[PDB]
Each structure stands twice: as C-alpha cells, then as structure tokens.
Design an enzyme around this catalytic site. Sequence first.
Site, PDB file in Angstrom:
ATOM      1  N   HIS A 124      -5.001   3.203  -4.238  1.00 48.64           N
ATOM      2  CA  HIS A 124      -4.105   4.064  -5.039  1.00 48.64           C
ATOM      3  C   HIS A 124      -4.382   3.962  -6.532  1.00 48.64           C
ATOM      4  O   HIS A 124      -4.056   4.873  -7.270  1.00 48.64           O
ATOM      5  CB  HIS A 124      -2.618   3.833  -4.699  1.00 48.64           C
ATOM      6  CG  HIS A 124      -2.008   2.657  -5.393  1.00 48.64           C
ATOM      7  ND1 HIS A 124      -1.914   1.433  -4.776  1.00 48.64           N
ATOM      8  CD2 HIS A 124      -1.459   2.568  -6.625  1.00 48.64           C
ATOM      9  CE1 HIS A 124      -1.340   0.623  -5.648  1.00 48.64           C
ATOM     10  NE2 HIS A 124      -1.053   1.250  -6.779  1.00 48.64           N
ATOM     11  N   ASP A 142      -4.449   0.842   1.815  1.00 46.11           N
ATOM     12  CA  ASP A 142      -4.548   0.778   0.368  1.00 46.11           C
ATOM     13  C   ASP A 142      -5.562  -0.249  -0.118  1.00 46.11           C
ATOM     14  O   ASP A 142      -5.209  -1.316  -0.641  1.00 46.11           O
ATOM     15  CB  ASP A 142      -3.159   0.577  -0.264  1.00 46.11           C
ATOM     16  CG  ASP A 142      -3.117   0.815  -1.760  1.00 46.11           C
ATOM     17  OD1 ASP A 142      -4.096   1.389  -2.307  1.00 46.11           O
ATOM     18  OD2 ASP A 142      -2.127   0.424  -2.386  1.00 46.11           O
ATOM     19  N   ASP A 177       8.659 -10.692  -8.302  1.00 46.06           N
ATOM     20  CA  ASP A 177       7.835  -9.702  -7.594  1.00 46.06           C
ATOM     21  C   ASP A 177       6.579  -9.416  -8.386  1.00 46.06           C
ATOM     22  O   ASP A 177       6.494  -9.776  -9.561  1.00 46.06           O
ATOM     23  CB  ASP A 177       8.631  -8.383  -7.431  1.00 46.06           C
ATOM     24  CG  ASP A 177       8.197  -7.433  -6.315  1.00 46.06           C
ATOM     25  OD1 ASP A 177       7.206  -7.760  -5.584  1.00 46.06           O
ATOM     26  OD2 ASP A 177       8.855  -6.387  -6.147  1.00 46.06           O
ATOM     27  N   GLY A 199       1.810  -2.338 -12.359  1.00 46.24           N
ATOM     28  CA  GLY A 199       0.687  -2.724 -13.207  1.00 46.24           C
ATOM     29  C   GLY A 199      -0.160  -3.848 -12.620  1.00 46.24           C
ATOM     30  O   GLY A 199      -1.276  -4.095 -13.080  1.00 46.24           O
ATOM     31  N   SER A 247      -0.991  -3.758  -9.378  1.00 43.10           N
ATOM     32  CA  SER A 247      -1.657  -3.069  -8.260  1.00 43.10           C
ATOM     33  C   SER A 247      -3.134  -3.393  -8.257  1.00 43.10           C
ATOM     34  O   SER A 247      -3.754  -3.390  -9.319  1.00 43.10           O
ATOM     35  CB  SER A 247      -1.505  -1.553  -8.392  1.00 43.10           C
ATOM     36  OG  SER A 247      -0.170  -1.164  -8.132  1.00 43.10           O
ATOM     37  N   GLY A 248      -3.643  -3.720  -7.076  1.00 39.39           N
ATOM     38  CA  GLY A 248      -5.056  -4.006  -6.858  1.00 39.39           C
ATOM     39  C   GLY A 248      -5.398  -5.470  -7.030  1.00 39.39           C
ATOM     40  O   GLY A 248      -6.488  -5.869  -6.669  1.00 39.39           O
TER      41      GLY A 248
END
Lengths: 254, 58
Positions: A41, A90, A186, A190, A192-193
């Site tokens: 994504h 993903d 959490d 930002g 992500s990946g």
Amino acid sequence: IVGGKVCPKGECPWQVLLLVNGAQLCGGTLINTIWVVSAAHCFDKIKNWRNLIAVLGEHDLSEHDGDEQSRRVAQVIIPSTYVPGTTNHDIALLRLHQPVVLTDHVVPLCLPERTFSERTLAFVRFSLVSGWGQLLDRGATALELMVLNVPRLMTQDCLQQSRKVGDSPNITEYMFCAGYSDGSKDSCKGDSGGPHATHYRGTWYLTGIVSWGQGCATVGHFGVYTRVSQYIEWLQKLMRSEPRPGVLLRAPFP
Amino acid sequence: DQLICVNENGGCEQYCSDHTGTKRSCRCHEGYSLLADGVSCTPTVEYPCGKIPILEKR
Ligand SMILES: Cc1cc2ccc1[C@@H](C)COC(=O)Nc1ccc(C3(C(=O)O)CCCCC3)c(c1)CN(C)C(=O)[C@@H]2Nc1ccc2c(N)ncc(F)c2c1
Ligand SMILES: [Ca+2]
C-alpha cells in the site's frame, strides 16, 4: 509509533526509510544487501517511480551523521493478489540497484524459512515494531527512529478482543494482529512497511510488516501486520529472478 | 517415519529438516554455519542477519 521509545542508534540496523522526491514515504526492512521488504500500500499513489530511494543506517532525520547509505530502488514487486486501496497481501519486495555495505549501523534482518516462522516464530509473544511514523494519532511524525514492543494475538483472540465496528476488513490468513486494545501503544500509518521483528535464540527475524488498522492507538483496535511467513517462497523465488524494465512489477501470487 | 522438527524445532537454533527415519538435520541462514553439536549456528561473516553489532560488541 505511539507509546514507544527512541530506538537507540544502531539497535534497529535493518530499518529502512523510503523516500520519494526526498520526502518520507514509508518504512521497510533490509533482508540482505540488495533486497528490502515493505508494504504494497506504500506504492498506491507513486507516480515518480524513478525517484524512489531506500535509506539504510538512518536514525535522526534532522542530521546527517555519515552512517546513512542511500540506494535507488530498481524494482518494486507486488503480489498479483494485492488490490490497491484494500488490506490483503500487503507486501512489496524492493530491489536496490546496488548493494548496501553492511556496517555496525546497516545489518539485514533474517528472513526466516516458512515452517520455522509458522511453528516457532509465530508463538514468540512479543516483537518489535519500528519507524518514523506518527507519535500521536493526527500528530507529528518522529524525527528519531522509534521502536515499540507489541504482543501478537491469535486471530480468533484478535476478533473477540476488538470493538464491534461495521464496514471493517477481515483479518485474513495473510495477516496477524499485534498490539494493545487500550489505545496506549501502536504503530501508525507513517510506520507502514516497517518491520515487525521477532527474537529467537539470539537472532532477530522478520515476521510481520506494518500494514493497517482503524486509527492509530485507537481504543478497541489492534495493529494489523502482514503475515510474512505466507510469502517466504514467493519472496525467495523473486530474489532469484532477473529484474525487468520499469520499476513496478506485479508478480503472480502464490 | 518419525516426525522430529514438529517438536521444539528439532532442537535447532535456526532451521530444521526431517529426513527418512529418526534423522534430523539443523540448518542455518546464509552468513552462518552449523556447529559440530549439529544444532547451534555461528556467524561466518562480520554482519550476520538478525544480530545487533553494537549489542554483540558489548
Ligand atoms: C492498507 C491500509 C493502511 C492504513 C489504513 C487503512 C488501510 C486499509 C483499510 C485501506 O487502504 C488504505 O487506506 N490504503 C492506503 C494506501 C496508501 C496510503 C499512503 C498514504 O496515503 O499515506 C500512500 C502514500 C505513502 C504512505 C501510505 C495509505 C493507505 C495511508 N494510510 C491511511 C495507511 O497507510 C494506514 N496504515 C496504517 C498502518 C498501521 C496501523 C496500525 N498498526 N494501527 C492503526 C492504524 F490505523 C494503522 C494504519
Ligand atoms: Ca540522519
């Protein structure tokens, strides 16, 4: 990352910062000198495929200390089953044009074998998630690499511990839940990946990818991570392949 | 044919493979070699994956 701490410089050496036109895109995980694992994504909106850079050995975004190594991204490989704007499959496998030089500050995370990851790593309760994402929901992103220890849940436990929300994606076999439902800690958009790294008998392994959730550190919701063990064979085959012209590559999955 | 890896990863520090009978072979990720104990993995390189050098050199 919400409710974590600064990852002491050099303690997250496999962390990758992805940049597009010099701007923060996403995180990623170095798995050897030329390959990076990130989330599909992260590339949903990219137009300038030729301006994608992976930075290894990064820590503080405000300062260049000389440990940083940049590499142009030659290929972004995404599974054919991934649908842009959705949650499933993903994952992205990134080929760097030239290898990074490993140093005290640039070290790859072990990509494990599937069976080992399913039978052993999947039951190590806590793992580290890291990135330069949001320090707060709808807040500023971090200037220093942050890290957070999160517990993994069985998907049955995830579903019954999460708030009843209509029009929410399923947690598939290509995902796992990790984190807390109390809104204290959490990984964020930002992040992500970035890696979800698991320690087993003195070695760290790649078990998940920061993927999605329903608002960062939101009460009643856990973070959702790509279940990397489902992609081991797909990743191994691709790492043995020759690159193709054009940065983006959609590759059949399985 | 015995199943060995299903149980505590066959005793292997890293990877485990089952063979015909009661045979088990442990293996390691690239950048590591298996010790003569047949279970432990030791780096063969200066920057093996999944090891944090600043902590390893402590
Ligand atoms: C796949 C996905 C991702 C996110 C939110 C929802 C989804 C799907 C349902 C719909 O699918 C999407 O929303 N797709 C999508 C595609 C591109 C972008 C990018 C963006 O718009 O920022 C594109 C440019 C580069 C960066 C990502 C973006 C989302 C931004 N964005 C909201 C994201 O990255 C979110 N990430 C996390 C990652 C981890 C989270 C965590 N542990 N706890 C709580 C969170 F809430 C989390 C949000
Ligand atoms: Ca820096």
